[PDB]
Design a protein around this nucleic acid. Sequence first.
RNA 1: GCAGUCUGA
DNA 2: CGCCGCGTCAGACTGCA
DNA 3: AGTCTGACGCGGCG
Lengths: 50, 1339, 402, 68, 51
Amino acid sequence: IETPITANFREGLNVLQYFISTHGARKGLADTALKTANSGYLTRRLVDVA
Amino acid sequence: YSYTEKKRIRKDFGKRPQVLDVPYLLSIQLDSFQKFIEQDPEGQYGLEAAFRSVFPIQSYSGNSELQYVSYRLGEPVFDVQECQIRGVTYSAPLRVKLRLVIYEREAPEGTVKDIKEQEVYMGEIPLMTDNGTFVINGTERVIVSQLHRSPGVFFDSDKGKTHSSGKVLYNARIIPYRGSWLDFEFDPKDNLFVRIDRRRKLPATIILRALNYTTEQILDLFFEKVIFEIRDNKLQMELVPERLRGETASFDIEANGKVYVEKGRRITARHIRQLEKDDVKLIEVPVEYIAGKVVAKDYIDESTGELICAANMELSLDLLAKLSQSGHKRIETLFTNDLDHGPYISETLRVDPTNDRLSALVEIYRMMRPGEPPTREAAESLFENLFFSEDRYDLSAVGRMKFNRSLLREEIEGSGILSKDDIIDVMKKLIDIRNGKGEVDDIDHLGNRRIRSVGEMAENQFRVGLVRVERAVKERLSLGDLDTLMPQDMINAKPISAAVKEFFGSSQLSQFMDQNNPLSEITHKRRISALGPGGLTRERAGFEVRDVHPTHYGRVCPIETPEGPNIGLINSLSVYAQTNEYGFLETPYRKVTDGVVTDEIHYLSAIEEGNYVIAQANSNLDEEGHFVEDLVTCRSKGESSLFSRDQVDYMDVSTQQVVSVGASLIPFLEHDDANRALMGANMQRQAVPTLRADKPLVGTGMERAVAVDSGVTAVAKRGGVVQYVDASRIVIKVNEDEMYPGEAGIDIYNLTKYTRSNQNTCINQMPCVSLGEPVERGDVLADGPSTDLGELALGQNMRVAFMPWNGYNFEDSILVSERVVQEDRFTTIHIQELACVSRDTKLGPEEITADIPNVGEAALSKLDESGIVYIGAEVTGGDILVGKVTPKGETQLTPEEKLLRAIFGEKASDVKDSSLRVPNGVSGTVIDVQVFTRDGVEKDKRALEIEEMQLKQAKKDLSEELQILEAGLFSRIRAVLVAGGVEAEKLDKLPRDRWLELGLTDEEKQNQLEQLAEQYDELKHEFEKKLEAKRRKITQGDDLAPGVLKIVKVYLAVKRRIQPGDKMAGRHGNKGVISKINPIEDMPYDENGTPVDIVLNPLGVPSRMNIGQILETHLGMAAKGIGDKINAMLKQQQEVAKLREFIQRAYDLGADVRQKVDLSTFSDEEVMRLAENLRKGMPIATPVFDGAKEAEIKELLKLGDLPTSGQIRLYDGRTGEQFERPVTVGYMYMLKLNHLVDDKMHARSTGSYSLVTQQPLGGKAQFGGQRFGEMEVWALEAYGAAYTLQEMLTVKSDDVNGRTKMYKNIVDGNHQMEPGMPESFNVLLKEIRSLGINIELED
Amino acid sequence: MGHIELASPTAHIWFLKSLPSRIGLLLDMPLRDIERVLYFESYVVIEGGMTNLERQQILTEEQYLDALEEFGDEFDAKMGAEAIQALLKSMDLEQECEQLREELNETNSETKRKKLTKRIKLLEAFVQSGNKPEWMILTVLPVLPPDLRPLVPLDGGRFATSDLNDLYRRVINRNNRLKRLLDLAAPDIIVRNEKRMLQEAVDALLDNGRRGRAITGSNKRPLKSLADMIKGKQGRFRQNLLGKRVDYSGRSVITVGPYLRLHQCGLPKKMALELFKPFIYGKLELRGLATTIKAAKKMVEREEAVVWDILDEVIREHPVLLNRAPTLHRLGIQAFEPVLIEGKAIQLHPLVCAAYNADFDGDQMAVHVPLTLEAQLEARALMMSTNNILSPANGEPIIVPS
Amino acid sequence: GITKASLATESFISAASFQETTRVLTEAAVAGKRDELRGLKENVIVGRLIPAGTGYAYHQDRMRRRAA
Amino acid sequence: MLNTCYRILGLKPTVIFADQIMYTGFAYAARSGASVGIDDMVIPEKKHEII
RNA sequence: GCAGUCUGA
DNA sequence: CGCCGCGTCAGACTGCA
DNA sequence: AGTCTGACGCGGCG
Ligand SMILES: [Mg+2]
């Protein structure tokens, strides 16, 4: 998004800057919740090949 | 203000003026179920529109009919509480008035022979309690709302993810509310295809040929005709000029003069306007222009009759001459110019093998029911009821609305089934989107997704039940019993009461309610679950449906969602969000007119919102309403950018419009990273209610709504004066202008005392009001669990310091002083229900007795003679609660034991000790014993004792309500007498029984006199019978499960104190586990000797940027610094003048705060009550995203004489010397989550084992044994720990001889295994040999 | 084990449908036609004779009854598992592979040589091993022992059934029904339908859902196969054989306890009393404080004050393994010496948290007790936390101040 | 690949316990295979000392007293 | 420092050194009183200009 | 024993 | 076009033959 | 077998 969060966490993020923040926050959380499966499956394949 | 809210006034730091007060939080559940069970005379909603959708029911032949005429919900047999105690459903009987009409076969028009109407009972439908929960089998459930893809038509794509060429394949999909999905899709060959119900695809025009269309009519629909008309020769063709745009011709074009383009040149736009101004009518082109064109018609030779060329055939020179010799001076041709139009239909009209309606129908039958040879009268009957029959396909009213909205039609209502033109227009818009005159739908748009909720899902299940009923009644009506048959004899109520019961009790969305605190209840009642029947699956949902969409602003909270495998699938409806009459989430906005922001609010849906320019809630406004800024930041079309203050069309109605009610209670949310705000919101719902509730010093003002809107609190229904107040009862005397005529005028609120929550916590209502106090309507009378004086209070205010202390706060740990355990700040009560179910066994029945064998009279001390524990008995782990013994057999005593019991002279008895015992580790008090005996079973002595206690309790409560209400009635009658025609001279003498009919002036006063006498007569007469009602409800037998004779349920209260291991948390996601209970004299203390209560790690702040826990800590210090001032003035006994002066100064502090507390309105009594409520700290309101700026926090600190830096110097409690740097000290609101270490600790040396595999069992309920999974076996293989691994495999779990040998060896001081083969491997061999496969060990 | 004598032969679904089909690859016959012959939808000619009735030819029934007169009864064509069994039992391996070895040696387009060497590999594997082809068609069905499909009596006055017990019963009915129709001499259309039902029932028992729509009982949820018992994340191999639940184990929340030394860990007294219970019984009987394992069991469950003095010796040099899942790497299991603490939370040295990836915001750990002397010495010499201060991934310290 | 090279081992117990169990069991049935328990998983299945580490010294005696 | 001790002195001095480091670091972090406050996050006065 | 739901790390 | 896989451990609650 | 069914994944692989 082309207008950044010009505010930091000592000042307040206003409600729009905060809503924007939530996009990347939930992308990170939903990435962690679903890439542990890929990591575990690759680990299991490596163990069973070796 | 209020009367309950000038007891303690939370200082509000909010600056925006509140335009729209927060709606009723539970209105989703309540509105939807009300629409389900309401009488709807228009017949659009609920039970009425489910009945009218089936009825009238006619027989297969038409000799008779069964017609619905009305319905009614009876009274529930058991109230909400009797249902929870007895373990039965809270439901109401559905009585429907059905009228069977027997028609004549002796009349041609179908005259009726006879009418028989009667009220048939079909099913019991579970009623919703006034809190939005359903009491099903005695457990409270919540049917969470579901967010599913709305019916309609959706054009989507796979953006270059097939055929490896990046070619975008566009596909439409028609999704009904029920019925068969209908998909159209392009191929990389640009041929159009159609799937039905996601099975194998056909050429698209097959469906167009299943409809009675010829190829000529199909090319009519999907094309526009260019016409060659050979007048003398050389291709005289009619052309509209703008057709040639983008087309390059190797021939030049002239007509009636000027040539306009050269041969081989591109026709330009200036050339197009040149063709325009020339008013061109016709053009002659070279003759080879025909080759490659396709004839738009089927042509027949008028001279011979022969088929010259079929339609859809591409023309050639020889074919052109063959046409010309036929007299067809005019020929037509599909306009298939590329990159604005397309031949897609012409080619898919070639690849289809079917050329007539019957071929299309039978081919559809082949693809639909494969392996079955088709039949014409069967194929067309399949096709008609695929998409064009009301009983197999319903595009619901939302489906028709979204349909006509997507195809850009004008009428939003119509038939619920598809038509020829509907499918045609879907294909046409799909072809458009292929050409580039459209765009694909966003599937995650909350204008494309829809809230289906309790009253809609229950109506769906009721429709399913009714259609099973009607398919039974249609064939039952064909019988010959017609003239003697009544409608009751043909309605089978088992399908209906099977469907609704299966839904309510076993569905995916009717979830066991989360009852930790009031916040858990509310946020559960407002979940939005994308899962469920008709929705996604938690594994098949991708990354795109999980994340937050720009249309989630104000409709769905972006930060409150579970963190596990269903992140982003379960959402929480935000504060002000609503649903349309269609089910699309809408949110309110203040309409901005000519620059001034009105107070008129409009609820905009996610599609209406896109068209406007919507300002932020943080956009400042002057006294009259203009944007004081000239470039305000706004949201238009999903993006966000600056606009001029006159382009703005709407404005947000509040700053907390965006977040749910869970994340609305996090103070200083605008400073926490959303990862930690998510955890704080999710952890506020697991905090258990402590012993003594404690308000937040720093809150957000949404506490009074969350507490009141859930049902944990007892709010006054009518204003009045507290007439009586007891720990279990509040009797309010209603005001004179609030009581209806003919009424006692007294409201009795019976408080719930110490009942078991769903999570085994304690829910307990304490009276908030005291005697004689006046209360208003809507004032809290009794605080629930986790509410303090009306506000939601989930945890306690602990004095935290942020500093590392000797490693005891290492890596998210928490170090608690011993004074937090001494003061019982975090001690919670948990109530466990243990059941002892006396079974009927084939060897005889088991019996509840206190004569258990194999146990001394020491352990039977707490049991009474009937075998059950005493109420109030403090029992510990292992105590017998209910003595039960079971008849047994097959002892077969072994030889050595045969000698043993003959030596010491007694053989074993015939019964087995099967008594109920307290689990290990739990130690509590028996606070309740409920005995249920099967009807026909002898009641033991304690059952009769409990029954007499219950009967005298019912008689006492009913005589007490009668003696309160009759006292109110006699007080009102005395009031009527003294109000005119004074009789106060003798009312002090007259007995109360004569007041009823004393003669007064009989125009109006004797009217209410006789009316109040009538009301007292009614009260007496109704008590007289309801006493016998609950008498027979107590004495009657119980509808127990089959096989059980009597059930004894024993309730244990366990006061569960805090200890190392218990999880605690703030509200900003700063969880932790207590490490140490430090002595009071080891905790860091300030100059004033005051020891800090909890020591937290500062290194948890800067990494996870939850700064809101520092600012709260600085505000909760300031908010307490004010309290310590008032505590001084109340101990010095300062005048109320000085107290009022200081409290007004504390309430006036702020940078233009929205609230004005003017104390000079408070009587000195009210100021002293306010000061005694504030002496523990002034509660402060920091509303989300407009909260206290930092300068106000420092100003409030400086008011309470504290250092504005927020950090004081501290001394070590142990060494007595000063920490080298100032330490952040302040009051953080800490929660105690339901992750108690008592519930987590487990160990097992040896226990019971599984049945097929002989490995141990799972979980501390079954005495567990921990899974040494695959990764732990690899971890042992990565060491050389082969012997450890062999003992984990053989002798610890699976080996059945190895484990007993190992046990006897461990006992004998010999640590040596004799490992054999695990029993699972032998099980695997047997399972592979039970295939045809001979697996065998080889020696 | 038991056995069901199938009234007719029945094709094993594993050797029919588990791509490539061993029966198809052996008969040089397409699977989409063997599936038709087996399910009684087409005839196939066992022996051709002097006619255009070649061996592997499929001919539909309407193309069969006209052949009833074209060549009389010189040929014999059949359908179902009897036909495929006759084809398998009739063919010769040592001659067929010898016949194929020259067609492979003579073809220059390797596109066919692929199929030829596939079939030659299969035929050489059948002749080298002692198997015979006609064993891919069941005529006897084994029956798993009944304590491995247990019929548990419920305390609710009921019997909770297994899935195999349905899939067996469902077979034993139809088979039995067929054994009647072979004696009632019912018309061949209805014994065709009953042989087809028996085939699909045996296939539903062996592997449910290989033929699409899977049999589901009473839950609208597919029944569990015999082959569903041994495959997947829930089959025996991953669930019971490659990892299994374990006695002498416990679980609790972890807590920092920074007073610890690198080799020891805080273990609650209440857990270390349960895990070490047979060791305590042994030390009680040794020191004369008891005379019988039942007397010692009573002394331990009462927790007399001498039991704790026993326990302080029983866990003197006795390591316990601590494990926090997921055990992503080798250092996820480490053996420490127990220091008996009084709480309920396992205390864990701060330095090993990085190696465990553990942080004290609510994590839990499993404790396991090495019983044997070899297992205690393995825990002490290989797995103790003072031996694991370097990472096995790279030679850099894992015990790093944090 | 690691999956194809895992399913192409000489052991059918190491490849049947990994994944694709019906494939591995039917091909090892029609081939008449023989799993000689030379890996780590084969000895974990059957309850033996793995040939790694402190079981290695065992697994060599088992070879130098049965191959003679 | 710990890796150097392991390479030069071996396992036993390192296992003692790690515990001594842990004890003294915890002790002097406690003596430190190192605490985070709202004034520690010093916003540069050029920010409101730079933006 | 299983399925569903929720939760924790 | 059909088949095969898609992390680990754990606690709780229902309903089911 | 009639559903007043469900579908509503994905990515390799053969
Ligand atoms: Mg953790």
